[model samples]
Each structure stands twice: as structure tokens, then as C-alpha cells.
Target: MEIGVVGKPNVGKSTFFSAATLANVGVTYAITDHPCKELGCSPNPQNYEYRNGLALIPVKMVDVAFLDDLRMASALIHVVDATGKTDPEGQPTDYHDPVEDIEFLEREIDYWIYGILSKGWDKFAKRIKLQKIKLESAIAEHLSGIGVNENDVWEAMHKLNLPEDPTKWSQDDLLAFASEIRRVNKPMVIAANKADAASDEQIKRLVREEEKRGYIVIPTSAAAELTLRKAAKAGFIEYIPALMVIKEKVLDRFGSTGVQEVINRVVFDLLKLIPVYPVHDEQFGNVLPHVFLMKKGSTPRDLAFKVHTDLGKGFLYAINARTKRRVGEDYELQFNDIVKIVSV
Candidate 1:
């Protein structure tokens, strides 16, 4: 569940990373309504922070130094200078489009994949051709570092109408396949950095343009977030994350600085993950001490398995903390679902 904070230089991704981490070592981002909110309770927090009835869930994020590292990242947060003032080369120019940064980042990932797959491909592809290996299995296994699956490999190839035999595949064919693989395997979120400097018009247009291209863009002011955080740490101001808000300029205009919001979008919106809490008992016992991000369709049974294989194997039923109703295996887990797995 690692996210890569990446983008073109001078876009302040480092500031975003530092700001996010300054808030928490693991970049605690999304604030979920803690299950304890429903009852008078104080949970001994584990892997998260509980404050004022909200849970700050910790998700790992890495500052990607090389495109090669994108292999392990489940999602990418592309930090871009949204102000339309800086050129692509990290230089200042009038009305420079941030869209280029968006386009370039995607292309770079594709190229990185192409470079890895093309080497010894003649030899590699020949072996697959001669050995009668399933092309999808071969490619998916070879690129497993990026979490590419057989279905993804198949879909990308079938859509591109690629030849079954890699021996028959041209360099352009390999490049196109790599591009499609990257597209499906690695989803991305756009952080429109420098939103404070960017005019409302600039932010709106950038958002509209990206949405048309099937991306979610969050307007972020990393500098403002960091400033308020430092001020709070030194007792100059009161800053309670996930509970209290900040700065008049950014906070007044764009709500919070959007660093945490960007992270939440990546984890929830892009990744399609939701937080599920597990407890030891139904009568406010254990009080939903742990929170985890599960795929949107995850069932309580899945949560049982997550807690322990024995619990899942012997699972009798689950209780919905909010409703106090016995839920079956078919019950689809929702956001902030607190389930008590009872095993005989």
C-alpha cells in the first residue's frame, strides 16, 4: 500500500512529501470518523492516531527518485506547478501549461517499462515462442514487480491486437504494450502544487482539462501547509490535524492546503480502498482499535481473514458496530465499517 510522490522538478513534490511526513512519519492522510465516535470510548490507537472522534490512517508514501522505483508503487501522486508560471525545465515563463507535466510523467513511466522489457527480448521472446509459453503469463510474471497480472497483460495485448508470439512483435509493438501495461498497472493522482499562487481561473482550467483526460486534480499549497505545521509545533498557532483547520490565505481560499486531501484521493478515490475496523467484541470491547484499507468490495469475511486465518476459518458471524446487527459473508464492507468477527 505504498504511494509514490513524483513529478517534474520545481513542482515542490519534496515540500509535499516533507509536509505530509511532518504531519506523520507514515504520511497520515485520510481522516475517517473513528468507530469510537458512536460510543463513549478511548481506544488504544495502533497504526493510527485518534483525535476528537476522528482516525488519521497511516499509509506509506515514498519520494520516488527514479522511475524504476515506480514498479513497487501502487499509485502515483504527480505533483505539478499549477500556477502556469514555471516552464517545464524548472524555469519561469508566462502562462506555461501544467498539462505538459501531466502528459510527460505518463510517457516517462511507459518508456521506463519499455526499456526494461526490450532488453534481451529477442532471446526472451524466442524462448517463449519455442517453449509454447502463454504470452500473457510470461509478460505478467516478468513485470510482476509492477503488479501486472495475466488479465491485465491479456487486456492490454488484446486491445492493441498484438501478435501472440513475442518473436513476431516489433519494437513499436513492445513499446505500445509497455505503455498499456503501465497505464493499467499504475494509477495516478494529480496534485496541482502552488495552488495558492495559481489564480482561481488557472486552477479551474487545470482541473477541467485533467478531468476531460480522466484524472482527478487536487489544488495544493505545500508551502502553506508546512508553514502552519511549523508554527503549530513552536506554539505560535493552534493546529490540530484532522480536527482543527489552518491559514487565512490558503485555508480561507482553498480550504486546507490539499496535501492531505491529495493523499486521501490517491488512497480512496484512485485506489478504490476503504477503511475497515476490527474489534474483539461487540459490547464496545477492544473498541475498534485498528483501521485498515481494504478494497471497496471486501466482505467482513475478508476482514476476518485479515485479522487471523483461524478467525476466518472458524468464522461464525460478524456484527456491525453501528447497527449491532449480525452480518453475513455477503455483507459488503463500507467505509469506516467496524466489524466484530466472532469465531467458534
Candidate 2:
């Protein structure tokens, strides 16, 4: 079980679990695992559920209690009011462009990272230049809690084709670098909230508009999700599906309440991660194969090291019957990105 966090204030914030709580260990996530059934393993369920030949693996995610902090995020959830009924200041309005929230929040994060880098950049840059240190780590060291590392740093710097001499960088250069760093690390999912109220045309426009911009926008209704699930788990029929409003409007109409996919998209699509099952019986001995997250491009070697130090050096091919060929940067990883590691 791994973790992810997100939620913005004033966008239909909730106490139930719409990413608006103080508990860092708030709600959990579960996804179906079908490979176990296909591969034919006698399942022994523990910690999680295994019914109907599917395992519901739970993920530990939290609602950062509502803040503007992205320091501890694997990815972010930008909950926007698709209704356009709310303005940027959270005031009531009409026919506003909810898309503005998406663009606005991005710049908000961009400037946030830029601010962090710009604060002590004068001395910071000088130190890196004088010590002939790697710019990647130099920047990452100051970006603590941002989950940044040298690879991430390198790509951003490389993408912009920035200067080797840190002292030579200008404010624009710094902001440019910061935005890319945010992009690489803080990939996002747009929860087009209040879907039940929004017209299909608006959602169609929103989804189509966002697709070209390289975003996965989903029409979601936290209001409906909270009500539906709350009634189911916590305890309602006088107000149960008896509320039927959410059922027909959100659930039956949209297929789901919209909450689940937002988190799943962040974990799988935005984060570029894949869940791999390792066999305890030599790739398929049937010992109770555990699920682990690995970078999509990661090889058996990396998995070995994660399993055991001794195993890392002595790794073997994944025996699950899959074939493939394996593959950086404009110095940074991007959609079609280069690399020049200039260090002392």
C-alpha cells in the first residue's frame, strides 16, 4: 500500500473525503487485480480483499487537510467547479470559465516553486558555481519535501537549455525551470467537480478542450459521491438512494460518482507507475505474490534490489510470459525529451 495526496480549498470542500481534511491518513483506495486470476494462482488473501477472482488492493492516500502545499505530493488533484458558478475568489458568479481555474492553479504552483528557488538563489547559485557542483542536486537540496531528485532537476534544467553558470540565470530563467520541475514531479488530474449540475455540452467542451492541453479531465461530483457512499457505509434510506437524485444524475448517468478515477489517474497515468506482481516461487511458484509499484521502464534488476540487496546484483527475467524491448532527456524527461550531466 502506497500513498498519494491532494485537494484544493473552496471547491466544494468536504469533511467526508473529498480531499478536504487535516488527516494525512484520511481515506484509502482499492483497485481490482485481474492478472492473478488470468495467471492462475490459488489466492490467499490477507490485509486486502479477494472475492469474485479479483483482489481489491487498498492504497493509503490522504487529504492534506486543505492547504496550498505541494511539497509532499506525488501528484495533485485540482478540483474545479465545472459549473463556472464560482469565481476565482470563491465568490458566487455565473457563466464563468472553470477552465480558468486549471490554468490559474498551474501558474500558482509554478510561481510557488519559483519563489522557493529565488529566495536564496544568489548565494545558492554562487555556491554551486564555486564548488563546481552538479546543478541538479544543488537545486534539489533546497527543494526538500518537494520529492525532487537529481534526475528531475536535470531534466528541467536541460529542457530549458539553461546556463551552466547558475549565477548567470535571470528571474525568467528561474521561473521557467521551476515550472518544468513542477510539471515533471507534480503531474495533475483535473476533477471537473459538480458534474451533476453542469450540462453535458459543458463537460464535452471541457473534456475536449483539456485533452489538447495534455490533461486528463473527468466530470466528477463529490457532492453525489459523499452522499451515496455515506448512506451506504456510515448509515440512510429515508435519505438513501431514496435520494435518487444523485443516483440518476451522477452515478447512473456518469457511471461512477467521479471520486475513484481522479485518484487512480494520479497514481497510474499521471505518476507513470505500474503495479507489478512478483512470484515467490521463482516467478510463479504460487507463494502469495505481492503487488509492488515500479516505474514502468524499470527492469528486473531494479525490482531485485527493492526485494533484497543480494537479489539486486543477481536478477533474472520476469517469468510471467511477457516480451518486450526496453528504452531520457533533453537532459530531462518530457513527452519527447536530452542529457548532459555537467558536474564537478
Candidate 3:
């Protein structure tokens, strides 16, 4: 699944993308027609190591160049600089309009979603008269005009119902369509960037607003996370920003407060998601591991094909790392499971 990291020009969207994916997303780029960017994140394998080898699709976070491309996103991670500062160097020079920032972002996202729904209206209007594939193909043809091919149209169509007529569709219809899209994709995570500089009241208010809009608002200091991640990569410390690791030596000299706690909370509590890696001990194609996601109640065999077709095709029993026993197809899976698949 793709989660587009989006916001205004300098809302730390790139920083959030870099920190999450550990990719070199250009923080400042020259404005161009195709100023959009993309990065991929393979969620930590430790999160879902216990599953029967289900790997979630590595999420691709894109910084869309235009509102049109932004509408193509399956989901969105809206990053807003709550403090409204150039960078998280410190607080704003004066009281910035946090409400305005929030409103503008809401408008932008709403407009983009409106475009998606508006474009698909004709196909949705004709759904009653056509077969499923035929209706989907028609929608695909229409979406292709806007650079969204048949596949994109099919996925988007899954989220909306057929309207009586395309011309009769209104803004409310589009909003409802967007809501369905978010429901299916479970997108709309809020990254309240620069939260360290924002007031507790503002953060609380933003959280309420996001929750009202059906988004999980996460207060994060992406600027801080990026600094810590880069420092760790440079061998200055042994800290992964979003993962808790015990340190034998004191490293607070770098000015990190509750780093491990924040990591744990974000990964476990706020996100409430984990990654699964499904691989057979034999015929391991590439050394690089794959990561997938599993919600609360997932089974081991359910994780097998999440990695690849070969492993799932050669399906066999799973060896659980925790129980150290071979589990059959009926075995239930838990969070952060590590399993060896005995497959063809």
C-alpha cells in the first residue's frame, strides 16, 4: 500500500519521509513541474516476526508534485508543521496561525479527493447498467485520461458506490466517496510534525480534530527523529529513532528525551501495526528480507504468500520460533513472529 506524505512547501514532509524510510529524500528541491518524490519503507521485521511468514507490502511514501497526482494516492500521511516554522530549530518568532495551517491542509486534501470522485462519477453513474468488469473497465478508461490506468480506477472504484448520474453528483457525494476510500485503505494518518515546539493545548486540539476526521494523529518530532537516525548511522550512537534499544552507555548528551519511550509508543500504541516476513528456509531467492503487515488476528499460513508467490505456492508447515514446534495450517499467528517455512 502507498501512503503519500503530503503538506505545503515547508512542513517537514521530506524530513518525515526520510526519517521513516531512511531514504535520502531531498529536503529542499528546485521547483519543477514534476517536483514530486517517492521513498519506500520496509517496516521493522521485529514487529511481526511471529507470523507464519506474512510480509506486508513495503509502503511507498510519495510527495506529490501537484494536487492531481496527490489525488491518485491510496492513502495519505498528512505532515503539518504545527509550530509553523521553517524548521524545528525552535518555536516560531510570533504566534503563527495553526488553525489556518490545518484548514488549508484540509482543503487541499479535500480538493484532491474531490477530483478523484468527480473523475469517476460517470463510471459510477453507469454501474447499474453494466457488468462489474465492464463498469470497472469504463472507469479505468476514464481514469487513464488523468494518468490513472485501469488498475488505479479498479482500486478506487472499490471504495465508492454508483451514483444515479455523473452530472448530478455534488461535493457531498465526493466527500462520501473519499470517506469510503479512506475506509478501505485505512489512510489518513496525521503526523503532527514539530510537536516539540507546539503547545500541549494545540497538540490536544489537533489530535481531537484529526480523530474527528477519522485519522490517527501522531505527535512526532520528525526533525528530532531525523537527527537521531543520522547520528546513529554515523556511528555516533546506537539508536534507531522509532525502535527501543537498551544502551550500555549514556548517550543523553545528545539531548534526547524519552526517545525509546516515544519509539515504543509510536510503533506499538499509535501505529498499532507490525511487519511480517514470510520466507522458506529453502530457495531463499534474495538475501534481503521482505516485510508485511498483519492486524490483530492473523494466522501463520495467511502470512506465507504475503512475501512472494513461490513461497506461498510451495506451501508447507511453519516452524514457530517461540514454541519451537511445527505448526500446521490452523495455527494462529501473533504479533512480531519469526517463523521458518518448510515448503517445496
Candidate 4:
């Protein structure tokens, strides 16, 4: 899960990055002039045990150079200054208009992504067409190579609207007509920041807009979360931001403040679901049995490495994580899976 942190300038993306990864994303040192950075995170389970160690890969959280560059993000976290109190520019006087900035940022990001996909659409469309033809010819030549029929292949290809002549298609036209592709292939999620200060109405509006566009949005306050994390790192507290662990003198002094409570709830819950690492039976040999909650496009190799390194390298095939059925390499994975594998 690659996440891109973004928002208007000074919206605390840097602070959130530091807090989440325990890295100094804001401070500039001799080695680097800018502190905008990337870091990896793992979901560390507390007092949790299984057959084998459960681990998730460190997802890269990219701190982009500018809001326009946010297009590179697979997912985006939009941080807003919820204070509502603003200057003439809609910010705190010295600050800029948060709402306007968000609109500009969104337009830029949308354009960037739309441009790339548009440029590549012709080639993608052609390839889909050719692949379908080959599949049909193969089926005619042989009754079955892999149980996939001509109909199935044709259905998949038809879904792409392949063989559509691209010479006359406008880039903008393609952009306007590629919802099926995006829906079936690309997905985007939204991370709503500064929930503490955002009014219920504002939150509701954002939620409605996101939902209309089929986006997944989560509300959080990166600033408060970062402060707690920094305090933890200083040994002032045994801090686990995502898990809401505040050990030591700071909590006693600060008590359970509103913003602090928000930080605890949002960060910890995210930690629980976000980072998932997989292990294979070859290395752990069924000793490390676990489950996978997949949506789609997950493969055996994906499962292997998600489990561990050696299993990924030695993976032979999979025994349905749920049923004991032996599945081939390309077998699509399902959600809530209980799988096992035979490995090298």
C-alpha cells in the first residue's frame, strides 16, 4: 500500500510522516537540505501470536515535492487546516486559502494522472485487442490449454473495449470515457486530516463528495499524532501512535485532551488494518498458518512474499488458504482467505 502524503503547504503532512515512521521529515540536517522524505511502516501486533511470525512489508509513504506531484501517489492524504479561523486568504492571514488550495491541488493531480493514462490508452487498448485474438486462435487450435475458454477470453477483452481505433480518439475523449478501466484497475483512497477542527458539516460535505466519486476517505489529525510520537521517541513516553500507547509522564500532565484523543483513535486503528505481511508454509510449514483478506488481483506469488522471503523464492503452488484445493500460479485470491502452500 503505497501512500502519498499531501495537502496545502504547511498542512502538517511532514509532521504526520515523521510521526508515522519515526523519521525526521521536517528537519534539515547536513546530509540533506530538505526533510521531505519517504519511510516504511509495518503493522506490529501487540501480544499477538500465530503459527509463524505475521509481518507486513514496509509500505513506502512518499512526501511529494509539491501538491501537483501528488499524482504519483497510489493513495492520497489531504490535510486541511480545520481551525476555520482564517485570514483574508482563508488561511490564518499568513496562510493560504485551504479550500481553494485543495481544489487546485485536486485539479492538478487529476490532470496529471488523466494525462498519463490518456497517453497510454491507445497502446493499452491495442494490446488488449491483440491478446484477445491470440486467445481465440489458441482456443481454436486446442480444446483447452488451461481451462480458460474463448468466451472467457473474449469477455475479458470486450471489457477493455479493445480494437477501438485510436487514431481519431482525443486524449481528453479517452479521459472522459475510461471509468470502466479505472473502476476495474486503478483505485484511490483519501485520508482526511485535521478532523478535530473540521466542522461536522464540512466533514459531511467532503464525505459526500468522495463517496459520489467512489473514494475511500479516513479522517485524522497528523499534527497531534506527530507530537505524541515525538514525545514517545524522546523516552518521555512509551508512545505507539497508531496503537494509542502513551506511557510515561506526558499523559499524566496533559491528561486526555480532545485532539490527543482523536490522535489516539485514528492512528491506532489505521495501524491495525494497514500493514499486512505474509508468510509461506515452505519456510514455516503450516506452522505459521494465517488468513488473507483480499479484494482482487492477488496471486500466489503475492501471497508468498507477503508471508516471507524464502517462501516467495521457493513457492511451488498454493493450497487454497481457505479450502484445501490446490490452485495454480495465477489463481485469483479472495478475501478472508485461510491458505497453505507447498514450497521449495
Candidate 5:
């Protein structure tokens, strides 16, 4: 998943990415190659192996150069200058309101969504109403590239309970709808950067404001994380990327440097993904070495498809390696599940 790391310039967006990329948890996998010739799979047979352990999946963090570039991201991480020393333009200042940074980014995204929705909206609205096209489908198609899906549009419309006729909607109505779209399509979390430099009072205030906005905010010090990573690389201190912070001083107060925490929350919580293990041998399982990240509600059949299209097409049932019990194709997969697909 591509997470767009964005904020005002010089809010340590670059530093955050640098720190994140430097810390790597290597996960080795022993995979099984299924080349079913009946389904036009490769003619050569592939061998398989396995191991037992936890694996870390690396995610792509894109530094969004422009505001409009956000459309390409699956989700966003808004890096805030928690020190409250940088203005909107990243200029140095004293006691700059970090809250304003949060509010401004939110507004900028809302307006961006609004601009897309308003483009040719007059004619598009009329067509939908006059032609009796489904409003949800129409809107979803109109904002296709912006990641606004039909379900999202429907939910937004249902919650708003606005007039059925789009032509009669006012500018405020449009803005409200756009805001809802932003919430659904572009879910974001705040990376409160510069936590080490900021006073404790400043961090707490930012946390309180974040709670009110229903955003997951992590106090992060990209500089400190970078330093720790460098130190670990130089054989100075043994550290785990997710476990180690700058020092006991910061760790006691605001938790770790929070670079890993930010990435973890955005991927697991906001994106609602879980890791599953697919194996061929339930008794002497070896393919469990590989961890596949799937959505929370993914079914056994979905996993079959993810593993191999041939297996999915000929899917009969699956076995829970742990329970050694047969599960149907529609069985909902849980986190860390060991599933063995049985196909024709």
C-alpha cells in the first residue's frame, strides 16, 4: 500500500521518510510454487519450504511533492510540526500554532475533493436526475480517480440526507458532501513530528485537539529516530525498529520516537488489514514462513485467489492448519490464520 506522507514543507516529512526507510526488519520466507498445468500453469514443477515466525511487511511511503499528488495514495500521513515553531510555509517562528497546520491540511484536502466534485457538476447533476441514473454510481464514476467509490458516495449521501435533486443543492451542501467524501476516501492519521524538540505541554495540547477531531495522532521525533537507526547500524546499540526510541527520557514520556507507530496504525487500524499464512501441508506445514496481508473480512476463497488463480478456480474447501478442521470457501479468515487450500 502506498502511504502518501504529506504536510507543509519543512515539517520533517523528508526526515520521517528517511528514518522509516533506514529501519528494516528483514523477514525471510520459504514459498511454495504452484504451477498447475490443467489451468495453463507453468509446466515445470516448483519446490516449497517453510519456517515458523513473525514477519514484517514493508510499505511504500511516497513523499507527496504537490497537494494534488495525494490522489495517487491509498491513505495519507499528515506530518505536523509538533514543536509549533514552523509557519504554514515552513518559515521559522516562535509559538506557531501546530493546530493550524492540522486544520489547514484538512481544509486543503476538503477543497481538493470539492474541486473534483464541482467540475462540470451542474451538467452532471442534471444528467443523473434527468436520466434517472443512480446518484451513487454517478458520483462514484465522476470522482473515479480520486478514490471515491460507489459505497463511499452512497454512505456520504445517506448520512447527509440532502435533497434528492442535486440541482437545488447550495454551495454549503456541496462542501459538506465533499467533506464526507474526503473522510471516507482519504482516511488520514497525524504524525506529530518534532516531539523531542517540543515542550511536554505542546504535545499534550496537540493530543487533546486530535482526540476531538477523531484522528490517531502519534508524537514522533524523526530526527531522533534517524539518529538511533544510524547508531544501531554502526554497532553502537542493539535496537529493534519498533521497540527502541531515542532515549529513556523520551520513551518515558511520549512513547517511542513513533515513526514505526505511525506506519503501523495507518496500515493495520486505518486500512483494516490483517496478516494470514497460507500453507499446502497442514500436518508438516512449511509454507507458513510467508505472511500475506489481507483485508479483515477476506474469505478463504479470496485467499485462494490471492495464492493462485488456478487454486481459486478449482477451490473445494480449506483446512485450518491449527484446528485440522475443514472450512468452507466462504469462511472468514482471522489474523495469523494458517490456511491450506484443497483444490481439484
Candidate 6:
């Protein structure tokens, strides 16, 4: 998953990326696979054995330089200076309102989409109306490269209920539609960075406002996490990235610096992805260490196609390794399922 890490700068966006990417950790699972012939055994190519491997996949965490960079990302992580020590422009001050930072980012994204839709809108509207085309489809197609799709546009349109004619849409109507589009297409999570220095009231206020707007607010200390990661790498401390945040105060208050939590939430919750394993041998030794990150409601056929086009094209049943029972192509895959596809 490509996650765009954004902020006004100096909010530890860079530090967050460093903590996540540099200190990369993997989730482990067991897989069985055939041993190599060089092991001095009468080689049975089909013979396999079980082995341990990391189950989770690595994510592409990108440091977004501008709001437009968001188009390449699957989701966004907005880092705010929770300590309230920096202004909107990243200037240091005695007090800065983080709420303003949050609102400004939202507005910037809305206007970005608005700018795209507003271009050639008059002519595009006329053509859409004259041809009796699907307005949602047309708009979605226009913004498809930027990650807005038909479903997102349809849902936004449904909520908007704009006039039948696009030409008649007012500035407010367009802005409202853009807002909805941003809401649907680019869901955001707030990373309250510098939580180690933030007061309880500051963190609570940010959380309260974010909840009202349906954003996941995570209290994080990127500097602290980065420090700990460096220390751990140098063998200065025995630390696990997931279990603890660097700053003890922040860790005790919020349970983590939230560096890792942000990645986990964006991958599993915002993206709604599940990890599934595909294997060649289910009953015998060493299965293939293939962990496919699929959408939540994906089927066995989807898994087959993901594994190989020929496997999917051949069309066959799948066996659930846990149950040892055959399942159809339409079977919905669960997280960490061990599946064996049978095809000609």
C-alpha cells in the first residue's frame, strides 16, 4: 500500500517515514515447501516441509511534498504538531493552533479536487448535458488518474443531489461535491506528532474534533520513535517497534508514539485489506511462502488470478488447508487463510 505522509512540514513527517521504513518489522507465519535435492536425499520433487516466515507485507510509505502528491497514495497520513509549538507555515511560536492545521489540510485537498473539476467545466458540462451522458461517470473518468472513481463520485453525487444540469451548478454546489469527493476518495488519519510534549488538553481537543469529522487521530512522537529505533539498531536497547513508543511519557499516556499504529490502521482498517497465503502442498511439507494482500471481500478466484493468470484461467476448486475440504471459486477468503488451488 502506498501511504502519502503529509503535513505543513516540521511536523515530523520525515521522521515518521524514517521510523516506519528504516525499522521495518515483519509478521511471521509458517509455510511448508519442498527441500532442495542437494540435501543428499533421494529427491522427491513433491516432498515438502514446514518453515517459518514473515506473514505481513511491506508498504510503500512516501513523503508527500505537496498536496498533489496525494494522488499516488492509497491513503493519507496527516501529521500535525500536537505540541502546538509551530505555526501553519512551520514557523516556531509559543503557541500554535493544531485545529487550524487540520482544517487547512482538508481545505487544501478539497480545492485541489475542485481545481480539477472546475477546469473546462462550462464546456464539459454542455457536452455532458447535450449527449445525455452519465454525469458521475464523466466526472469520475476525468478524475480517475487522481484516484476518484465512479463509485466515489456516485456516492458524492447521491449526497449532493445537485441540479439536473451541470451548467446550473453554483460555486457552493461544486465545492460541496468536491468536499464529498475528498471525503470518499481520500480518507485521512491524523498523526498528532510531538505528543510527548503535548498537554493532555491539547491531545484531547484534537481527538474530539477529529472524531466529529470521522478521522482517526493517533498521538505520535516521531522524533522519539526515531530515537528509539536508532538506539535499538545500535544495540543500545532491546526494543520492539510495535510494543512501545520511544518517549515513555507518551507511551504511558497514549500507549504508543503511534508511528507503527498509523501504518497498521492505514493498511488494515482504511484499506480494508486481508493477508492470505497460497500454497502448492497443503497436506505435506513446505508450502510456498506466498502471502497475498487482498481486499476484504475477495474470493478464491481472485486469489488464483493474483497468483497466476493461467491458474485463474484454468478454472478449478480450492482447498482450505485448515479444513482440508474443497471450496468453490466463489469462496470468500479470510485473513491468514492457507489455500491450495487445484487447476489443470
Scored by lDDT, the top model is: 1
Q: Which candidate do you rate higher for TM-score, 3 or 5? A: 5
For candidate 6, lDDT tens digit of each residue in 231-276? 7544443223244433564566766557777776777788777777
TM-scores, one per candidate: 0.86, 0.80, 0.60, 0.54, 0.82, 0.81
Model 2 segments more than 4 A misplaced: 1-10, 15-22, 39-42, 65-69, 231-250, 282-286, 313-318, 321-344
lDDT value for model 4:
0.45
TM-score of 1: 0.86
TM-score ranking of the models: 1, 5, 6, 2, 3, 4
* Candidate 5 residue-pair clash tally: 1
RMSD of each: 3.8, 7.2, 9.9, 11.2, 7.1, 6.6
TM-score of 6: 0.81
Once superposed on the true structure, which residue ranges of model 5 sit more than 4 Å away at CA?
23-53, 162-165, 236-255, 283-286, 328-330
Q: For model 5, where is the 10-residue window of minimal lDDT?
A: 24-33
lDDT of 2 by residue, 206-280 (tens): 889987887889888776666655565555422112555646555677777667777667767887666655444
lDDT of each: 0.81, 0.64, 0.52, 0.45, 0.73, 0.73
Clash list (residue pairs), candidate 6: 27-55, 32-286, 32-287, 33-286, 33-287, 48-285, 48-286, 49-285, 49-286
Superior candidate under TM-score, 2 versus 4: 2
> lDDT tens digits, residues 285-332, model 3?
532254455554566666766766777788777887546678768776
Across 17-118, the per-residue lDDT of candidate 1 in tens digits comes to 887776212454676566776564878876688877777887787877535666788888889999978888877788779998889888888888898799
Q: Candidate 5, clashing residue pairs?
A: 50-286
Instruction: Please report the TM-score between candidate 3 and the true structure.
Output: 0.60
Candidate 5 per-residue C-alpha lDDT over 1-344 given as tens digits, one digit per residue, 9 for 90 to 100? 56777888788987887777662121111122221212222222123222122245546667676366678577788898998889889998886887888888888889988987787789877997889888888878888888777888888988998766778777887899999888877889899998877888888889898878978888998877777777764445222324443365765566567877787788778887776767777724333444566889898888888878998899888898778899866788886577888888
Against the correct fold, how does model 4 do in TM-score? Answer: 0.54
Number of clashes found in candidate 3? 15
Ranking by lDDT: 1, 6, 5, 2, 3, 4
